[PDB]
Amino acid sequence: VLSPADKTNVKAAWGKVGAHAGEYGAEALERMFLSFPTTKTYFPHFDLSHGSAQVKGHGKKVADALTNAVAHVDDMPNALSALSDLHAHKLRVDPVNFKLLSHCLLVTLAAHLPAEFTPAVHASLDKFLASVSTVLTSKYR
Amino acid sequence: VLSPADKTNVKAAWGKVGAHAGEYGAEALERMFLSFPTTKTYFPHFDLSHGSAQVKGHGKKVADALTNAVAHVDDMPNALSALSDLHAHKLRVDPVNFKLLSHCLLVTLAAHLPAEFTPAVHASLDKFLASVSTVLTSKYR
Amino acid sequence: VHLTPEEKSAVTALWGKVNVDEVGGEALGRLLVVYPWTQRFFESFGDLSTPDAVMGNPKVKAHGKKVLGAFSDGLAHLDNLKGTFATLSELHCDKLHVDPENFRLLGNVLVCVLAHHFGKEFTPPVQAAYQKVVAGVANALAHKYH
Amino acid sequence: VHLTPEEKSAVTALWGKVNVDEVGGEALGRLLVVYPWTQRFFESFGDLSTPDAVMGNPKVKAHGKKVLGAFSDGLAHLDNLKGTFATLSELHCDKLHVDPENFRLLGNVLVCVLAHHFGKEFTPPVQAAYQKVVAGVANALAHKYH
Ligand code: HEM
Ligand code: HEM
Ligand code: HEM
Ligand code: HEM
């Protein structure tokens, strides 16, 4: 569960992302494909090459789902139910992969927000992502 | 998230343990210690040899908690609040371990309740153990 | 995989009583039912809408025995599950796009099926050797993923 | 571990620019803050109640320097991580009773500390190589557990 400071921390860290969310989503993705090649098994129909816009296109989508979750930090389950419906029933992504992407996102953020990526902010973001991941896999069975 | 079918199924299987819960709890512990020796890092103060009384005693502890979870299937969080407090603040067992124990409890059960351990009963208890696990690690951070 | 000979001897010994047909059928069936997202690789098997729809499906079954049958044979190469599985590795990666985590899932369903079936005989220690087996298999199969 | 040579060359190049005293304190401190349960091994370290109590705690900061000094040395032996960490594997098992999962947690927190520090410089491919490294270390550290 997100505490008031978790929320505050994620509203502010994400706030700074501002503009690059999509840019950042894309990189998180590239970081995941590369470090955790097993993750590529879900994106067989994609171009997984540096700068593919399939990846850029996908990145932005991810980042907007996160922006939305942030915006409804107080009602995440409802805010992303559509997205859980989808991952649960159509994509059927092994839950373990949510943890790998989340990590790549944390790596991406730390790489772009030197100044705001504090222990406190790091902790908050990690919990945030895990709750996002939890929401997303809630309808698997 | 336990469906009424799931709940019904766990009530079933568990009722049949009846008297042996303790016996089964201890066997589960014993299969975990041997199958996943890293789990032993948490019981350095237990004699872990076969037929140990500590293990034995601990088995029944766990068994009884599971029983209590079965009984309060619809309010686990409240039924197990004390226990989540305990695991999260004093014990602090790494969340990944909940999975090894659950699995061992699954094998134990499978091996003692052949007839009742149907694909659907199996699917159910698995979700059961998973929610018990989530409840115990819900207050970690 | 690091098996003791007592470990290896006990593996071998119960393996000898495996009816791979029904055990492979049971193992793959249970997977699809317990971890329903593993079903994503078998829509072409047909109706998987129920445990029975799934357990009783001839496709599940025959795939079960196929898999379990390839399982059986790395037991003959416990010393090189790696080279034993290299091609299957590439095929699951390169062609089937199977998430190797599914392999772990399988190993655990299996260990559960074996217990189910051997009751009393699938002892703390027999489970333990098998756990070592299904873990080496999962890794050998995941080996060539790139 | 099986690093390409451009991979081991990348690992090594960057590693040369890291300040171990403070990177060590930083990764250990961040571990205790993000995965607070890991604090179970350090009650004798004092106040760890707040991020600042943790991050600026001199025992936390002095312990961090040892781990990374130790990590830094296995870096010189990518080809023999296991032998490198064999005594430390035993120590951690046999005496400290540390769940090896703590090793993976630290690896990731480390990866994040590097990114944070190197920025643009910690590129996808540079991360992928470190991911390989930290996994190797976690495994070599867990090797002797029993
Ligand atoms: C917190 C993490 C995640 C978020 C926010 C997220 C969000 C999304 C969104 C917004 C879409 C597009 C849906 C649409 O078209 O409206 C999508 C699709 C997809 N996701 Fe996720 N996802 C996450 C985790 C994952 C993971 C871990 C994987 C696999 C490793 C994955 C695999 C997929 C795939 C294969 C698609 C289909 C996209 C396509 O074909 O273009 N997702 N996800
Ligand atoms: C189904 C999941 C679990 C349940 C229901 C459970 C239940 C319990 C119960 C009822 C107690 C006794 C507390 C008391 O004295 O009132 C306990 C203690 C303990 N548990 Fe858990 N537990 C679970 C998972 C785990 C796991 C996975 C581990 C570590 C591998 C673990 C390690 C411990 C330890 C070390 C103790 C304290 C032993 C002692 O001081 O004698 N538990 N647990
Ligand atoms: C874990 C140990 C496993 C082994 C030893 C194994 C073995 C095999 C073998 C020998 C084949 C046949 C190749 C051929 O047609 O020449 C096969 C096919 C296949 N396996 Fe695996 N398998 C394993 C796990 C899995 C899992 C867990 C899944 C997914 C849930 C999976 C999905 C598939 C698929 C989709 C095919 C293609 C079958 C067809 O339609 O011909 N495998 N497997
Ligand atoms: C990840 C790679 C790691 C390395 C290379 C490492 C290295 C070391 C070294 C060199 C020592 C001192 C040895 C001695 O006193 O003889 C030590 C002690 C210790 N380590 Fe590790 N360590 C690692 C990870 C961890 C983790 C993840 C934890 C748990 C969070 C941990 C917990 C401890 C504890 C509790 C001590 C004893 C400290 C004291 O109270 O004196 N270590 N470690």
JSON list of C-alpha atoms and ligand atoms in Angstrom, two decimals, chain A residues 29 32-33 36 38-46 54 57-58 60-67 69 80 83 86-87 91-102 105 128-134 136 140, chain C residues 40 99, ligand 1:
[
{"chain": "A", "resi": 29, "resn": "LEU", "atom": "CA", "xyz": [11.54, -1.47, -23.11]},
{"chain": "A", "resi": 32, "resn": "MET", "atom": "CA", "xyz": [14.24, -5.03, -20.81]},
{"chain": "A", "resi": 33, "resn": "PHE", "atom": "CA", "xyz": [14.63, -6.75, -24.24]},
{"chain": "A", "resi": 36, "resn": "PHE", "atom": "CA", "xyz": [16.09, -10.06, -20.12]},
{"chain": "A", "resi": 38, "resn": "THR", "atom": "CA", "xyz": [13.31, -14.01, -22.44]},
{"chain": "A", "resi": 39, "resn": "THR", "atom": "CA", "xyz": [10.98, -10.97, -22.50]},
{"chain": "A", "resi": 40, "resn": "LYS", "atom": "CA", "xyz": [11.25, -10.81, -26.29]},
{"chain": "A", "resi": 41, "resn": "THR", "atom": "CA", "xyz": [9.00, -13.91, -26.50]},
{"chain": "A", "resi": 42, "resn": "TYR", "atom": "CA", "xyz": [5.92, -11.69, -26.20]},
{"chain": "A", "resi": 43, "resn": "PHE", "atom": "CA", "xyz": [6.96, -9.31, -29.02]},
{"chain": "A", "resi": 44, "resn": "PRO", "atom": "CA", "xyz": [7.64, -11.69, -31.85]},
{"chain": "A", "resi": 45, "resn": "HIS", "atom": "CA", "xyz": [5.62, -9.58, -34.26]},
{"chain": "A", "resi": 46, "resn": "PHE", "atom": "CA", "xyz": [7.71, -6.51, -33.55]},
{"chain": "A", "resi": 54, "resn": "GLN", "atom": "CA", "xyz": [7.23, -0.25, -33.16]},
{"chain": "A", "resi": 57, "resn": "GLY", "atom": "CA", "xyz": [5.09, 3.42, -30.40]},
{"chain": "A", "resi": 58, "resn": "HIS", "atom": "CA", "xyz": [4.82, 0.76, -27.72]},
{"chain": "A", "resi": 60, "resn": "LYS", "atom": "CA", "xyz": [4.63, 5.76, -25.40]},
{"chain": "A", "resi": 61, "resn": "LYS", "atom": "CA", "xyz": [1.58, 3.58, -24.74]},
{"chain": "A", "resi": 62, "resn": "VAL", "atom": "CA", "xyz": [3.21, 2.09, -21.65]},
{"chain": "A", "resi": 63, "resn": "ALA", "atom": "CA", "xyz": [4.28, 5.49, -20.37]},
{"chain": "A", "resi": 64, "resn": "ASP", "atom": "CA", "xyz": [0.72, 6.84, -20.83]},
{"chain": "A", "resi": 65, "resn": "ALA", "atom": "CA", "xyz": [-0.78, 3.93, -18.88]},
{"chain": "A", "resi": 66, "resn": "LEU", "atom": "CA", "xyz": [1.69, 4.84, -16.12]},
{"chain": "A", "resi": 67, "resn": "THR", "atom": "CA", "xyz": [0.81, 8.55, -16.36]},
{"chain": "A", "resi": 69, "resn": "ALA", "atom": "CA", "xyz": [-2.17, 5.30, -13.02]},
{"chain": "A", "resi": 80, "resn": "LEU", "atom": "CA", "xyz": [-6.31, 0.28, -15.27]},
{"chain": "A", "resi": 83, "resn": "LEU", "atom": "CA", "xyz": [-5.42, -3.04, -19.02]},
{"chain": "A", "resi": 86, "resn": "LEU", "atom": "CA", "xyz": [-6.20, -7.35, -21.52]},
{"chain": "A", "resi": 87, "resn": "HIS", "atom": "CA", "xyz": [-2.93, -8.63, -20.02]},
{"chain": "A", "resi": 91, "resn": "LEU", "atom": "CA", "xyz": [-1.68, -11.17, -23.85]},
{"chain": "A", "resi": 92, "resn": "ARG", "atom": "CA", "xyz": [-1.39, -13.61, -20.90]},
{"chain": "A", "resi": 93, "resn": "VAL", "atom": "CA", "xyz": [2.12, -12.37, -19.97]},
{"chain": "A", "resi": 94, "resn": "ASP", "atom": "CA", "xyz": [3.84, -14.42, -17.24]},
{"chain": "A", "resi": 95, "resn": "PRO", "atom": "CA", "xyz": [3.58, -12.35, -14.12]},
{"chain": "A", "resi": 96, "resn": "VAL", "atom": "CA", "xyz": [7.29, -12.57, -13.57]},
{"chain": "A", "resi": 97, "resn": "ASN", "atom": "CA", "xyz": [7.84, -10.27, -16.54]},
{"chain": "A", "resi": 98, "resn": "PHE", "atom": "CA", "xyz": [6.15, -7.33, -14.77]},
{"chain": "A", "resi": 99, "resn": "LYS", "atom": "CA", "xyz": [9.01, -7.37, -12.27]},
{"chain": "A", "resi": 100, "resn": "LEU", "atom": "CA", "xyz": [11.70, -7.18, -15.04]},
{"chain": "A", "resi": 101, "resn": "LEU", "atom": "CA", "xyz": [10.08, -4.30, -16.87]},
{"chain": "A", "resi": 102, "resn": "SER", "atom": "CA", "xyz": [9.52, -2.44, -13.58]},
{"chain": "A", "resi": 105, "resn": "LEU", "atom": "CA", "xyz": [11.83, 1.56, -15.68]},
{"chain": "A", "resi": 128, "resn": "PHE", "atom": "CA", "xyz": [4.39, 2.21, -7.09]},
{"chain": "A", "resi": 129, "resn": "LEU", "atom": "CA", "xyz": [5.47, -0.08, -9.92]},
{"chain": "A", "resi": 130, "resn": "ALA", "atom": "CA", "xyz": [4.77, -3.16, -7.89]},
{"chain": "A", "resi": 131, "resn": "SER", "atom": "CA", "xyz": [1.21, -2.03, -7.20]},
{"chain": "A", "resi": 132, "resn": "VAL", "atom": "CA", "xyz": [0.78, -1.26, -10.89]},
{"chain": "A", "resi": 133, "resn": "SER", "atom": "CA", "xyz": [2.05, -4.80, -11.66]},
{"chain": "A", "resi": 134, "resn": "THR", "atom": "CA", "xyz": [-0.25, -6.24, -9.00]},
{"chain": "A", "resi": 136, "resn": "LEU", "atom": "CA", "xyz": [-2.32, -5.81, -13.95]},
{"chain": "A", "resi": 140, "resn": "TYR", "atom": "CA", "xyz": [-5.00, -13.94, -14.31]},
{"chain": "C", "resi": 40, "resn": "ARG", "atom": "CA", "xyz": [-1.97, -19.01, -24.76]},
{"chain": "C", "resi": 99, "resn": "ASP", "atom": "CA", "xyz": [8.61, -17.97, -22.05]},
{"chain": "E", "resi": 1, "resn": "HEM", "atom": "C1", "xyz": [3.67, -2.10, -15.49]},
{"chain": "E", "resi": 1, "resn": "HEM", "atom": "C2", "xyz": [3.90, -2.65, -16.67]},
{"chain": "E", "resi": 1, "resn": "HEM", "atom": "C3", "xyz": [3.04, -2.59, -17.96]},
{"chain": "E", "resi": 1, "resn": "HEM", "atom": "C4", "xyz": [2.25, -1.65, -18.46]},
{"chain": "E", "resi": 1, "resn": "HEM", "atom": "C5", "xyz": [1.86, -0.25, -17.91]},
{"chain": "E", "resi": 1, "resn": "HEM", "atom": "C6", "xyz": [1.73, -2.13, -19.72]},
{"chain": "E", "resi": 1, "resn": "HEM", "atom": "C7", "xyz": [0.85, -1.46, -20.55]},
{"chain": "E", "resi": 1, "resn": "HEM", "atom": "C8", "xyz": [0.45, -1.84, -21.81]},
{"chain": "E", "resi": 1, "resn": "HEM", "atom": "C9", "xyz": [-0.33, -1.06, -22.74]},
{"chain": "E", "resi": 1, "resn": "HEM", "atom": "C10", "xyz": [-0.87, 0.37, -22.50]},
{"chain": "E", "resi": 1, "resn": "HEM", "atom": "C11", "xyz": [-0.47, -1.79, -23.83]},
{"chain": "E", "resi": 1, "resn": "HEM", "atom": "C12", "xyz": [-1.20, -1.43, -25.14]},
{"chain": "E", "resi": 1, "resn": "HEM", "atom": "C13", "xyz": [-2.71, -1.67, -25.07]},
{"chain": "E", "resi": 1, "resn": "HEM", "atom": "C14", "xyz": [-3.46, -0.92, -26.16]},
{"chain": "E", "resi": 1, "resn": "HEM", "atom": "O1", "xyz": [-3.12, -1.20, -27.35]},
{"chain": "E", "resi": 1, "resn": "HEM", "atom": "O2", "xyz": [-4.34, -0.10, -25.74]},
{"chain": "E", "resi": 1, "resn": "HEM", "atom": "C15", "xyz": [0.20, -3.05, -23.64]},
{"chain": "E", "resi": 1, "resn": "HEM", "atom": "C16", "xyz": [0.31, -4.11, -24.54]},
{"chain": "E", "resi": 1, "resn": "HEM", "atom": "C17", "xyz": [1.19, -5.16, -24.52]},
{"chain": "E", "resi": 1, "resn": "HEM", "atom": "N1", "xyz": [1.94, -5.51, -23.40]},
{"chain": "E", "resi": 1, "resn": "HEM", "atom": "FE1", "xyz": [1.90, -4.45, -21.66]},
{"chain": "E", "resi": 1, "resn": "HEM", "atom": "N2", "xyz": [2.22, -3.40, -19.98]},
{"chain": "E", "resi": 1, "resn": "HEM", "atom": "C18", "xyz": [3.04, -3.71, -18.89]},
{"chain": "E", "resi": 1, "resn": "HEM", "atom": "C19", "xyz": [3.77, -4.90, -18.72]},
{"chain": "E", "resi": 1, "resn": "HEM", "atom": "C20", "xyz": [4.05, -5.80, -19.75]},
{"chain": "E", "resi": 1, "resn": "HEM", "atom": "C21", "xyz": [5.05, -6.84, -19.71]},
{"chain": "E", "resi": 1, "resn": "HEM", "atom": "C22", "xyz": [5.97, -7.14, -18.53]},
{"chain": "E", "resi": 1, "resn": "HEM", "atom": "C23", "xyz": [5.01, -7.48, -20.90]},
{"chain": "E", "resi": 1, "resn": "HEM", "atom": "C24", "xyz": [5.85, -8.68, -21.40]},
{"chain": "E", "resi": 1, "resn": "HEM", "atom": "C25", "xyz": [7.09, -8.88, -20.95]},
{"chain": "E", "resi": 1, "resn": "HEM", "atom": "C26", "xyz": [3.96, -6.86, -21.70]},
{"chain": "E", "resi": 1, "resn": "HEM", "atom": "C27", "xyz": [3.59, -7.27, -22.97]},
{"chain": "E", "resi": 1, "resn": "HEM", "atom": "C28", "xyz": [2.66, -6.64, -23.77]},
{"chain": "E", "resi": 1, "resn": "HEM", "atom": "C29", "xyz": [2.37, -6.99, -25.14]},
{"chain": "E", "resi": 1, "resn": "HEM", "atom": "C30", "xyz": [3.00, -8.19, -25.87]},
{"chain": "E", "resi": 1, "resn": "HEM", "atom": "C31", "xyz": [1.47, -6.11, -25.57]},
{"chain": "E", "resi": 1, "resn": "HEM", "atom": "C32", "xyz": [0.77, -6.00, -26.95]},
{"chain": "E", "resi": 1, "resn": "HEM", "atom": "C33", "xyz": [1.26, -4.79, -27.71]},
{"chain": "E", "resi": 1, "resn": "HEM", "atom": "C34", "xyz": [1.34, -4.81, -29.20]},
{"chain": "E", "resi": 1, "resn": "HEM", "atom": "O3", "xyz": [1.14, -5.90, -29.78]},
{"chain": "E", "resi": 1, "resn": "HEM", "atom": "O4", "xyz": [1.61, -3.67, -29.70]},
{"chain": "E", "resi": 1, "resn": "HEM", "atom": "N3", "xyz": [3.38, -5.82, -20.99]},
{"chain": "E", "resi": 1, "resn": "HEM", "atom": "N4", "xyz": [0.77, -3.06, -22.37]}
]
